[PDB]
């Protein structure tokens, strides 16, 4: 355990957090993994969805390479303040935080080859502009965009670690209103005027379920409309009955529409 | 020995097929974030049943009855390694009397009303017409009020089926 202590002291001593790995060299490639713990508040009112994730970043830093210790050094999370970490940020987020009980849910893991794993437990609300014209018979595309704030492709490069297996846990997700038909990962360099900036994007296609609406809204409307036709089979002279039936069907339909407007 | 006082909001997936006659097992799971099974392992101080103690007065539940707790331990194999996960499951059963008095029983009496129309003389056409259509309106109001007090799940709960069947009954009576 002591030898590990002087090893860690050697690594951290003379370490400049201001300089990225391969500062003068080629760009540092940052692999990314996500494990979706939950997707909770898919809000049509606010045009956003809440998502909890384990977000891992992998990158090789030769300064932190060590030898003579054949095990992966999982260090206390506070050392993340002492190491360089990427400039990653979620472009479309509105409110995000790291869970902080019992401690800040961070993980720093060094490997003998110099690889650094940086894991964060993040709950973030992300904007998802919904076209609800076909509501409730609608399908939404909700995306999470990941970008580097202050680095271009000549300095930092993003990729999905493990290919299409980079994002996991989507198969285990289920929403009360939606079902995840498909999820996609795409990596691309946004060619901004200053330069090309790396970007990753995780998209979900959500299909709304209509069991709610077949019972709540469509069936009472259909049956009230059917009841409105009973007036045709009543004699023309029975003015009170036919009038009461028709106008009370109007009132019931108004009640349905108004209370549906309130609830939805 | 390291003691803390915490307030934890935790996810509880619920199968609301049998609402309000449904029962749930809400989990509380914890473990090390960074250290895998080969580095840090959690254990219960005493026997697992007696290592999670609920206070006698500590049941702040309105619509649920906390039947008991089940304490266990397990392993989770994540993308970063295997982790020991210590879990508790609180077993909750919903209280049904509210939905009996507020939803089921008014719906039953409204269906009984809609059926009482058959005992009026057939020549009271306006009376029976108004009676049936106003009964349909009453069921509409009751159904709206009932579903105001549910979460926005997709599939049909038991009380939804009860309301739909009663609504079909008043429709068929008219």
């Amino acid at each position: 355990m002591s030898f590990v202590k002087e090893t860690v002291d050697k690594l951290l001593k003379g370490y400049d957090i201001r300089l990225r790995p391969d500062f003068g060299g080629p760009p540092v490639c940052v692999g990314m993994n996500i494990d979706i713990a939950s997707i909770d508040m898919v809000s049509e009112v606010n045009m956003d969805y809440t998502l909890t994730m384990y977000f891992q970043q992998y990158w090789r830093d030769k300064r932190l390479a060590y030898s003579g210790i054949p095990l992966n050094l999982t260090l206390d999370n506070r050392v993340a303040d002492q190491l360089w970490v990427p400039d990653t940020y979620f472009l479309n987020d509105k409110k995000s935080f790291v869970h902080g009980v019992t401690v800040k849910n961070r993980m720093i893991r060094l490997h003998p080859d110099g690889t650094v794993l940086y894991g964060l437990r993040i709950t973030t609300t992300a904007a998802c502009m919904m076209d609800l014209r076909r509501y409730p018979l609608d399908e939404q595309n909700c995306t999470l965009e990941i970008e580097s704030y202050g680095y271009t492709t000549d300095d930092i490069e993003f990729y999905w670690r493990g290919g299409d297996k980079a994002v996991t846990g989507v198969e285990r997700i289920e929403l009360p209103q939606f079902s995840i038909v498909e999820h996609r990962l795409v990596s691309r360099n946004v060619v901004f005027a200053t330069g090309a900036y790396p970007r990753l994007s995780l998209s979900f296609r959500l299909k709304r379920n209509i069991g709610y609406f077949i019972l709540q809204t469509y069936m009472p409307s259909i049956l009230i409309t059917i009841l409105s036709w009973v007036s045709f089979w009543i004699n023309y002279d029975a003015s009170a009955a036919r009038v009461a039936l028709g106008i009370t069907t109007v009132l019931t339909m108004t009640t349905i529409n108004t209370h549906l407007r309130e609830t939805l | 020995l390291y003691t803390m006082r915490l307030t934890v909001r935790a996810e509880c997936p619920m199968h609301l097929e049998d609402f309000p006659m449904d029962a749930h097992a809400c989990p509380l799971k914890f473990g090390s974030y960074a250290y895998t099974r080969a580095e840090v392992v959690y254990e219960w101080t005493r026997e697992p049943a007696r290592s999670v103690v609920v206070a006698e007065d500590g049941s702040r539940l309105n619509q649920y009855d906390l039947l008991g707790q089940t304490v266990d331990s397990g392993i989770v194999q994540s993308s970063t390694g295997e982790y020991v996960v210590m879990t508790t499951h609180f077993h909750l059963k919903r209280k049904i009397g509210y939905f009996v008095i507020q939803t089921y029983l008014p719906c039953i009496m409204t269906v009984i009303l809609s059926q009482v129309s058959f005992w009026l003389n057939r020549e009271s056409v306006p009376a029976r017409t108004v009676f049936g259509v106003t009964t349909v309106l009453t069921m509409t109001t009751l159904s709206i009020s009932a579903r105001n007090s549910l979460p926005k799940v997709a599939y049909a709960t038991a009380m939804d089926w009860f309301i739909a069947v009663c609504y079909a009954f008043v429709f068929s009576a008219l």
Epitope: E171, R172 | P13, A25, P27, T70, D72, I75, V76
Partner: nanobody, 108 residues
Framework: GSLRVSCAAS????????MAWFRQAPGKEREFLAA???????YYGDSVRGRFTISRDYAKNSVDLQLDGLRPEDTAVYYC?????????????????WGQGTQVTVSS
């Protein structure tokens, strides 16, 4: 000897349910073996801890049990079960769905 017992579920999606395996040797006693919940958390019985491994395919809605290190006393009928664990997660009464079973025999 090594073996793998798979269980495919049809008729309902068991993403939120706890999928488990039980064993029944001759003499009519059902024994809990392994279980996995929605969080991929694996619970095991003491008798088969570290030997049998339980996994789930949520896309295919199936649960697999890999059996390594079989001994003659493991000869029994293995049942696949599903259901939310109420008062349970180690009791057969908490599972509302059960499989036909699979007979496994070991000879020395």
């Amino acid at each position: 000897g090594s073996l793998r017992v798979s269980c495919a579920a049809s008729g309902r999606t068991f993403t939120t349910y706890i999928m488990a395996w039980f064993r029944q040797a001759p003499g009519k006693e059902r024994e809990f073996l392994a279980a996995m919940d929605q969080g991929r958390i694996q619970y095991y019985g003491d008798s088969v801890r570290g030997r049998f491994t339980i996994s789930r395919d949520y896309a295919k809605n199936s649960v697999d049990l890999q059996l390594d290190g079989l001994r003659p006393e493991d000869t029994a009928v293995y049942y696949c079960a599903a259901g939310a664990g109420f008062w349970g997660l180690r009791t057969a009464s908490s599972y509302h769905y059960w499989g036909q079973g699979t007979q496994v025999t070991v000879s020395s």
